[PDB]
């Protein structure tokens, strides 16, 4: 039945766009002697080259790149004038070698100039025909693009005559206009695939066709000149016979001497400056926030190159977060705005957003966080109960309200969201793990403002690394980004903040994450262990870190120090000798020096090392698991990871 | 604490450790057996387990006992004292291996302490009793020539020999009056039938490890893990948690279904992995509740036990404490025992999800089956376990000394071929399905599909709830961390038990099972040509030598000498061809490469969310599903999805979630609020209960069908390879002896080349099928469930809002708040996460030598094939993995490769890789540099092999075949650049050879290529030599690092990735690539101004930029620019709290030498411009400048450049600027600018920025 409803128009328009993108961007991978090549599948039918058979890619492998061009053989040997015979006076000693060596050097250059002659022939006679196919292939892509616009235009013009609300027609016109931008972008991907595909074919015909001919022609031109040097040295009389064999062996050209070819050194020739500008000015980011505290100055701005506009209320302070400076919305009714035309999504666009978050609300109350909705159309993130909620609403009233449960107060989280329209898939990550995997097949059109707003209600918050992409992301990218950002020189707390000297803490073991260490007296000595399963009500001990260099604040990897316990009397950790248990002493002189460090894949955990032996828990002993200097292999490796506060 | 005793079968009876026993199923009729006490409360009886078996059942017949195993019969096993003594010695060895690790000691410790409760369900609650067949066993005291005298003892475990089948083991419980004390919380004596000689064989078809010769060839089980697996069943029986509930029942309504007995939830819990995910959360809560009730029963008795009747010697107070510890009860001051849920929860999860075959195997480093439903192969015999050369206590078969530990080579059938013996097909019995058309073929019942019935899943979701002010959301997680279990064991505390001696048994009431055989053949009629028929067509009788490939399914199925093939017509046409002696050696290489290319064909997927690639010939090979053999397989897949592959679409069970009933409190405002909160939390529980119900159905009905398809394909591919070799071997024997002597082909090389290709094909098929399976769950099962959950949400919303209104008066000032909360709460969905149910979370693949790993001032091979390395006193080594070779005679290394594995001679699949540092040419010695060539590495025997040589300025790789033909490929670096990227600097090399081309990569980029199609055969082997060999100066040397050899061709992506991993380091590097150091003089070099350097002004405290000098009196062939010029800098520690290596993000001083003093680089605290010159002045401290720097590395790709950042203070977030070079135009200045701070954050990092620096120390490899 004919299209008569905006909902049916949206479904028709989406199918045309997805089918067009699959057709135009099709490729296949071929392993060649020459490297790895991406073959454009539709090249055969576009211009009728090797189009006489079932498959284009199969024919390409059998015949090779040469089969594409029309004039196959065009090479011509130039005129060579190697008079290699040295031109005899004096020279009575073996110091003749000085004269002969300079002749040896020149013959190498003459071999090179011939090599450049063949490259120029390849450029002028063999590359020219490849560049012609590139231009024709581009003309073909644009021609097909021009036809799809007409089909879409005709359908919309017909629909304008039907009985649909003036306002709904306005939105359909806006959605169609933004789709034309997406078709242009997808066509630009295909053009890039064509370029590299034929550039590698052109470079390769040199390796397999022109280069072997250059070998054969120069092979004879050596037999003609090396013999001419042998004849000369017999004529020379002053030097002894025994030296004649030596110098002949020392001035003889093998095939190696004239062999010049680098697959990389030719690619540098093919690349112009215009290609450098294009790669230096293209990115997937619509927004890349750059924050920089300065003396009586804040700098907050977008360095993504699309020049998003930023507006923020004064009193927005900068503070160190995870790996640089974070916005601190300390006081209520504070806001930040980002303005860009790309933020109006529509029907076909795909995008991603990611940022770090830390919430000091510690209250169970709903609150707005980040929003791009206008008249209940668009998306947003906000707090509910303990966790977060992500919402996305359609012009027709289709919704997705997804609940994320992990979030609690005073911790650092990494949130990453992706929207994919070719696959109709939604992905959400928290830190390292994939939380949600949904189909948004029913969502259709989303059209909203050009402004994204970041706000507070009463909760103070830190935000860091806010960024927006114009494409979807995969699981592998998320994991790499997460760990790479945390791979800096600082040790962290259990909550993700930097450790500090001269600050109180509680000590936990990774194997038992909810029991804290407490002091135990067995003999006159004092030890540490985790609390048993019944006396968990007991209060844990309190610890501090100390460095000899006072005025040092934050702990970094490979720093040395001591460990102190608060109480009526100062205590310090020391290793017993009778057993390797850790015991407390009341003298700072006998306190052991310990090294602090962590693991790349356990960012918020810590380790203590003494003379390259880690400190770990022990196997059960009556009611106690002691803290010891371990050397056994019968204790799990996990037992030597600790956490503070 | 656990002690193992020692015995010999011929030792006299002592009535303390060797006795005469009357086992439970003897019913007190006599026939005593001789027993040995392996350990406290554990006994061994070396005899055949004959109870309930007919005497004639010990001989093989037409019958069978089990329908899912190959059964081996041997009526002479254990029939003489010599054999009977061999049984005890092996048993003692296996127990010693179990207690060699803490996890094994805990399992034995729990079994000893887990005494059965001295009671039974028929006993009054106020007493103990011991005249029960499940508690006591009789022993004989009287001498053989005396009237009988008996005595009783306590025991926990009794171990027998195998019954009629030797490769099947069991644990049996004792049942009285059809009731089992082991399923009612009490516990009882357990029995086990065991045989440690014949073991099971499995395979790892689902494990991906790339192109490997020995991957997926069959493994045999470690008998120690078999015993442990059976000991977990004992642990359940002793603690009385062996409950029965809803089992898994197979579907048997179609000819292609697998037939089996019901499976109990305990068996799946015991196995571990993702198998407990097949039990729905509804049944998890059901089992948890029955166990809790039974423990509540036991506590009632401990509070009421006062007297003992059977034995007056029993001390009640002693026993009460044992049971209190066994069940982890809690005691109060008054003397009352109770249960605390926290304690009970930890106990329950330890026994059920803690001790599992998957956890035990991981800890001991043994290989086992992937899943309970995985396929099995015929058993084997282990020749001798008592031989320490084969089986050791510390590491079993995987002995590291023999190079059998890597990848579990110890249990690999193809490798460790001396530890086992194949069984004679005569004695094996199997259950077979014989399917005749209207021809007839036989298929083992293990080869069909397994599909669970609709009756195996519970529907407790559809029952009503009652919500009250104190309702909790119970939820059982199927997990318990293993490390918490290990740390809980005590290896020093003593073990103490009551006396075992007691009164004799008098009541012999007990139930003895009975067994019977069943017919082992079943006949059916069917006319469908399914997977079973399409595999039988790819076989030929061993009696026929002449065969030919065909694409006609019917033609192959009709003629005895014709074989079906699903490859291309091209491949089939070539294979049937006949050629002459002049072309046999070329035809063989051509076809075998075609087979490897025919398999390993794949296509990418773009428009489907979950799948990534497709294999197009699966339909032709098997014809499984809706006649996938017809038309184009790929086209049909796109329009229909994964449904086309399933042989049977199952009906999905989805209950309607029951209604909530909310209580009515009169005036408690707080209680009304709590009931609303409890209902909202309880709703999130129903979401996870529904998701669990779907995943269980997917694992046992859809995922099993896909597994059978993976096995079919692996079987189908091997059939093709067998046929190809038989065709080759026939054409070889036809040639006359005279003519045959001129054909040199190695059949061993042919066989391994094919196996390597098959492994690559199976990897692609795994990825494809795994995507298809998951894709089905997300798109055709989960959405049908979310729909009925959303219906439940709507119904609940009406119920809650109506509940608020009826209590509106009591909620003064709160009704409006609750109504908002309910509306907001029930609008969201709880998203589905698969990672909860599955255990789901490459560099090292195909490595045969990993030579350069420094250890204790020596090199060693970490490969795990045990190559021998000899380093002579002339070689220099350091802990940075950097050895140096020299012109001295003793500067040499020798590596002797193991004979077992070497690269194929006929096809040449292998690669080499390393780092290298070649010094600079001498200025005067130019002529010698350009002409002389020397070798550095050599592997050649009889002048046939490979080598690596350095001609002047050129690095080469040559290859010589048996007939003396030579090839070569090389890389050449410019020697005219002002600043070279290679001349004395570390760089990465990688060489690669296949049957067609040789390639060389430098830092991950292809550099050269050469054609080697002509090369006949390379026969190098045995030895590798590192040594400078040739006309060289006395002052020649080379550095090397990270040398390795791969037995497979490497891809461009792998080489590029390997470049980054080996380039990574937490410290900074200097100009040459060596680590940067404190207190060492350096020269500065700016990346953006490579031709300029720094100097101190003659009258001002500002550095001036000059121009780098260039080579003078130039020889026309050489050109470069100086490096040892300008100011010498030095990096100093700022703190000294903490080795001299500089690490990223360090705070430093940047000093330099002026005449005979040390100066420092300062900056003005305040300037009114983006750029300003730096201040140079002697050492001092003041409030006018900043003298703190932090050394940074902004780039993420490998590099030798670093950036220098000024800061106000260590704890401050303020930044001043980055050091660099700026032009104030046309002068250049040593400046600090704020401008760079924005640039360094732009992606991609710009290498040409003016803020990138390198440090150049003096080196012996570079001269003026």
Short mmCIF file of N, CA, C and O in Angstrom, two decimals, chain B residues 310-379:
data_model
loop_
_atom_site.label_atom_id
_atom_site.label_comp_id
_atom_site.label_asym_id
_atom_site.label_seq_id
_atom_site.Cartn_x
_atom_site.Cartn_y
_atom_site.Cartn_z
N UNK B 310 23.08 -47.56 72.58
CA UNK B 310 23.88 -48.59 71.87
C UNK B 310 25.19 -48.84 72.63
O UNK B 310 25.52 -50.00 72.90
N UNK B 311 25.90 -47.77 72.98
CA UNK B 311 27.26 -47.87 73.55
C UNK B 311 27.36 -46.97 74.77
O UNK B 311 27.29 -45.74 74.64
N UNK B 312 27.57 -47.52 75.98
CA UNK B 312 27.76 -46.68 77.16
C UNK B 312 29.12 -45.97 77.21
O UNK B 312 29.28 -45.08 78.03
N UNK B 313 30.05 -46.34 76.34
CA UNK B 313 31.41 -45.73 76.31
C UNK B 313 31.38 -44.37 75.62
O UNK B 313 32.40 -43.66 75.69
N UNK B 314 30.28 -44.01 74.96
CA UNK B 314 30.20 -42.73 74.22
C UNK B 314 30.10 -41.58 75.22
O UNK B 314 29.21 -41.59 76.07
N UNK B 315 31.00 -40.61 75.08
CA UNK B 315 30.95 -39.36 75.86
C UNK B 315 30.12 -38.35 75.07
O UNK B 315 30.59 -37.86 74.02
N UNK B 316 28.94 -38.03 75.56
CA UNK B 316 28.01 -37.13 74.82
C UNK B 316 28.65 -35.75 74.66
O UNK B 316 28.57 -35.18 73.56
N UNK B 317 29.25 -35.22 75.70
CA UNK B 317 29.84 -33.85 75.63
C UNK B 317 30.93 -33.80 74.55
O UNK B 317 31.01 -32.78 73.85
N UNK B 318 31.72 -34.85 74.41
CA UNK B 318 32.79 -34.89 73.38
C UNK B 318 32.15 -34.82 71.99
O UNK B 318 32.61 -34.00 71.17
N UNK B 319 31.13 -35.64 71.76
CA UNK B 319 30.49 -35.73 70.43
C UNK B 319 29.79 -34.42 70.09
O UNK B 319 29.93 -33.94 68.95
N UNK B 320 29.09 -33.83 71.06
CA UNK B 320 28.30 -32.61 70.80
C UNK B 320 29.22 -31.54 70.21
O UNK B 320 28.77 -30.80 69.31
N UNK B 321 30.45 -31.45 70.69
CA UNK B 321 31.39 -30.43 70.19
C UNK B 321 31.83 -30.76 68.77
O UNK B 321 32.05 -29.83 67.99
N UNK B 322 31.96 -32.03 68.44
CA UNK B 322 32.38 -32.42 67.07
C UNK B 322 31.32 -31.96 66.06
O UNK B 322 31.70 -31.31 65.06
N UNK B 323 30.06 -32.27 66.33
CA UNK B 323 28.96 -31.89 65.41
C UNK B 323 28.81 -30.38 65.37
O UNK B 323 28.58 -29.83 64.30
N UNK B 324 28.98 -29.72 66.50
CA UNK B 324 28.93 -28.24 66.53
C UNK B 324 29.96 -27.67 65.55
O UNK B 324 29.64 -26.70 64.86
N UNK B 325 31.14 -28.27 65.48
CA UNK B 325 32.18 -27.82 64.54
C UNK B 325 31.83 -28.27 63.12
O UNK B 325 32.13 -27.50 62.18
N UNK B 326 31.27 -29.47 62.97
CA UNK B 326 30.99 -30.02 61.62
C UNK B 326 30.03 -29.10 60.87
O UNK B 326 30.33 -28.69 59.74
N UNK B 327 28.92 -28.73 61.51
CA UNK B 327 27.85 -27.93 60.87
C UNK B 327 28.03 -26.45 61.14
O UNK B 327 27.17 -25.68 60.69
N UNK B 328 29.08 -26.05 61.86
CA UNK B 328 29.39 -24.61 62.10
C UNK B 328 28.23 -23.91 62.82
O UNK B 328 27.95 -22.76 62.52
N UNK B 329 27.60 -24.59 63.78
CA UNK B 329 26.60 -23.96 64.65
C UNK B 329 27.27 -22.92 65.55
O UNK B 329 28.51 -22.75 65.55
N UNK B 330 26.43 -22.18 66.26
CA UNK B 330 26.88 -21.14 67.23
C UNK B 330 26.32 -21.49 68.59
O UNK B 330 25.21 -22.04 68.68
N UNK B 331 27.08 -21.16 69.63
CA UNK B 331 26.73 -21.50 71.03
C UNK B 331 26.63 -20.23 71.86
O UNK B 331 27.47 -19.33 71.71
N UNK B 332 25.65 -20.19 72.75
CA UNK B 332 25.45 -19.06 73.69
C UNK B 332 25.89 -19.49 75.09
O UNK B 332 26.16 -20.70 75.33
N UNK B 333 25.91 -18.54 76.02
CA UNK B 333 26.35 -18.76 77.42
C UNK B 333 25.47 -19.83 78.08
O UNK B 333 26.02 -20.74 78.72
N UNK B 334 24.16 -19.76 77.88
CA UNK B 334 23.20 -20.65 78.57
C UNK B 334 23.44 -22.10 78.15
O UNK B 334 23.11 -22.99 78.94
N UNK B 335 24.00 -22.34 76.97
CA UNK B 335 24.27 -23.71 76.49
C UNK B 335 23.29 -24.14 75.41
O UNK B 335 22.98 -25.34 75.31
N UNK B 336 22.83 -23.19 74.59
CA UNK B 336 21.88 -23.46 73.50
C UNK B 336 22.57 -23.22 72.16
O UNK B 336 23.17 -22.15 71.96
N UNK B 337 22.46 -24.18 71.26
CA UNK B 337 23.01 -24.06 69.90
C UNK B 337 21.98 -23.39 69.00
O UNK B 337 20.77 -23.52 69.20
N UNK B 338 22.46 -22.68 67.98
CA UNK B 338 21.58 -22.01 67.01
C UNK B 338 22.30 -21.87 65.67
O UNK B 338 23.53 -21.99 65.61
N UNK B 339 21.53 -21.54 64.64
CA UNK B 339 22.05 -21.27 63.27
C UNK B 339 22.10 -19.77 63.06
O UNK B 339 21.09 -19.08 63.31
N UNK B 340 23.22 -19.29 62.55
CA UNK B 340 23.33 -17.90 62.04
C UNK B 340 23.45 -17.98 60.53
O UNK B 340 24.32 -18.71 60.03
N UNK B 341 22.60 -17.26 59.83
CA UNK B 341 22.49 -17.38 58.35
C UNK B 341 23.83 -17.05 57.69
O UNK B 341 24.18 -17.73 56.71
N UNK B 342 24.57 -16.10 58.22
CA UNK B 342 25.87 -15.70 57.62
C UNK B 342 26.81 -16.91 57.61
O UNK B 342 27.48 -17.14 56.58
N UNK B 343 26.88 -17.64 58.71
CA UNK B 343 27.76 -18.82 58.81
C UNK B 343 27.26 -19.91 57.85
O UNK B 343 28.08 -20.47 57.10
N UNK B 344 25.96 -20.19 57.88
CA UNK B 344 25.37 -21.27 57.05
C UNK B 344 25.58 -20.94 55.56
O UNK B 344 25.89 -21.83 54.77
N UNK B 345 25.45 -19.67 55.21
CA UNK B 345 25.58 -19.26 53.79
C UNK B 345 26.98 -19.57 53.29
O UNK B 345 27.12 -20.10 52.18
N UNK B 346 28.00 -19.24 54.08
CA UNK B 346 29.40 -19.49 53.66
C UNK B 346 29.65 -21.00 53.57
O UNK B 346 30.34 -21.44 52.64
N UNK B 347 29.10 -21.76 54.50
CA UNK B 347 29.32 -23.22 54.47
C UNK B 347 28.69 -23.77 53.19
O UNK B 347 29.35 -24.55 52.48
N UNK B 348 27.44 -23.42 52.92
CA UNK B 348 26.70 -24.02 51.79
C UNK B 348 27.41 -23.70 50.48
O UNK B 348 27.58 -24.56 49.64
N UNK B 349 27.81 -22.46 50.29
CA UNK B 349 28.43 -22.06 49.01
C UNK B 349 29.80 -22.70 48.83
O UNK B 349 30.23 -22.87 47.68
N UNK B 350 30.49 -23.04 49.91
CA UNK B 350 31.83 -23.67 49.83
C UNK B 350 31.67 -25.08 49.28
O UNK B 350 32.43 -25.47 48.37
N UNK B 351 30.72 -25.83 49.83
CA UNK B 351 30.53 -27.25 49.45
C UNK B 351 29.99 -27.33 48.03
O UNK B 351 30.42 -28.23 47.30
N UNK B 352 29.11 -26.45 47.62
CA UNK B 352 28.41 -26.61 46.31
C UNK B 352 29.23 -25.97 45.19
O UNK B 352 29.52 -26.63 44.21
N UNK B 353 29.64 -24.73 45.34
CA UNK B 353 30.31 -23.98 44.25
C UNK B 353 31.80 -23.80 44.51
O UNK B 353 32.47 -23.28 43.59
N UNK B 354 32.30 -24.20 45.68
CA UNK B 354 33.73 -24.10 45.97
C UNK B 354 34.50 -25.26 45.35
O UNK B 354 35.38 -25.03 44.53
N UNK B 355 34.23 -26.47 45.81
CA UNK B 355 34.94 -27.68 45.31
C UNK B 355 34.27 -28.18 44.04
O UNK B 355 33.12 -28.66 44.10
N UNK B 356 34.92 -27.97 42.91
CA UNK B 356 34.40 -28.36 41.59
C UNK B 356 35.55 -28.85 40.74
O UNK B 356 36.68 -28.33 40.88
N UNK B 357 35.26 -29.80 39.86
CA UNK B 357 36.29 -30.39 38.98
C UNK B 357 37.02 -29.29 38.22
O UNK B 357 38.20 -29.45 37.97
N UNK B 358 36.33 -28.23 37.85
CA UNK B 358 36.95 -27.14 37.08
C UNK B 358 37.91 -26.35 37.97
O UNK B 358 38.98 -25.95 37.48
N UNK B 359 37.55 -26.12 39.22
CA UNK B 359 38.45 -25.40 40.16
C UNK B 359 39.64 -26.29 40.52
O UNK B 359 40.77 -25.77 40.50
N UNK B 360 39.39 -27.56 40.79
CA UNK B 360 40.48 -28.46 41.23
C UNK B 360 41.49 -28.57 40.09
O UNK B 360 42.69 -28.51 40.35
N UNK B 361 41.02 -28.77 38.86
CA UNK B 361 41.91 -28.97 37.70
C UNK B 361 42.77 -27.74 37.47
O UNK B 361 43.99 -27.91 37.20
N UNK B 362 42.18 -26.57 37.60
CA UNK B 362 42.91 -25.30 37.38
C UNK B 362 44.06 -25.19 38.39
O UNK B 362 45.21 -24.98 37.98
N UNK B 363 43.77 -25.42 39.65
CA UNK B 363 44.77 -25.30 40.74
C UNK B 363 45.94 -26.26 40.53
O UNK B 363 47.10 -25.81 40.64
N UNK B 364 45.67 -27.51 40.16
CA UNK B 364 46.72 -28.54 39.97
C UNK B 364 47.37 -28.44 38.58
O UNK B 364 48.33 -29.21 38.34
N UNK B 365 46.86 -27.59 37.70
CA UNK B 365 47.37 -27.50 36.30
C UNK B 365 47.24 -28.86 35.59
O UNK B 365 48.23 -29.43 35.17
N UNK B 366 46.01 -29.33 35.48
CA UNK B 366 45.65 -30.53 34.69
C UNK B 366 44.64 -30.11 33.63
O UNK B 366 43.94 -29.10 33.80
N UNK B 367 44.55 -30.85 32.56
CA UNK B 367 43.58 -30.59 31.49
C UNK B 367 42.37 -31.50 31.68
O UNK B 367 42.58 -32.73 31.92
N UNK B 368 41.18 -30.97 31.50
CA UNK B 368 39.96 -31.80 31.58
C UNK B 368 38.95 -31.36 30.53
O UNK B 368 39.22 -30.38 29.83
N UNK B 369 37.82 -32.06 30.49
CA UNK B 369 36.72 -31.76 29.53
C UNK B 369 36.20 -30.34 29.72
O UNK B 369 36.21 -29.82 30.84
N UNK B 370 35.74 -29.74 28.64
CA UNK B 370 35.19 -28.37 28.64
C UNK B 370 33.82 -28.34 29.31
O UNK B 370 33.51 -27.34 29.92
N UNK B 371 33.00 -29.37 29.16
CA UNK B 371 31.61 -29.37 29.65
C UNK B 371 31.14 -30.79 29.92
O UNK B 371 31.74 -31.73 29.45
N UNK B 372 30.06 -30.90 30.65
CA UNK B 372 29.44 -32.21 30.98
C UNK B 372 28.95 -32.92 29.72
O UNK B 372 28.95 -34.14 29.69
N UNK B 373 28.53 -32.18 28.70
CA UNK B 373 27.90 -32.75 27.48
C UNK B 373 28.92 -32.91 26.35
O UNK B 373 28.51 -33.32 25.24
N UNK B 374 30.19 -32.58 26.57
CA UNK B 374 31.22 -32.68 25.51
C UNK B 374 31.40 -34.15 25.11
O UNK B 374 31.06 -35.06 25.90
N UNK B 375 31.92 -34.37 23.92
CA UNK B 375 32.08 -35.72 23.34
C UNK B 375 33.23 -36.46 24.02
O UNK B 375 34.17 -35.80 24.54
N UNK B 376 33.20 -37.78 23.94
CA UNK B 376 34.26 -38.65 24.53
C UNK B 376 34.75 -39.67 23.50
O UNK B 376 34.03 -39.96 22.54
N UNK B 377 35.94 -40.20 23.72
CA UNK B 377 36.58 -41.16 22.79
C UNK B 377 36.89 -42.46 23.52
O UNK B 377 36.74 -42.52 24.74
N UNK B 378 37.30 -43.55 22.83
CA UNK B 378 37.53 -44.82 23.51
C UNK B 378 38.67 -44.71 24.52
O UNK B 378 39.60 -43.90 24.34
N UNK B 379 38.61 -45.47 25.63
CA UNK B 379 39.63 -45.37 26.67
C UNK B 379 40.96 -46.00 26.26
O UNK B 379 41.05 -46.68 25.22
#
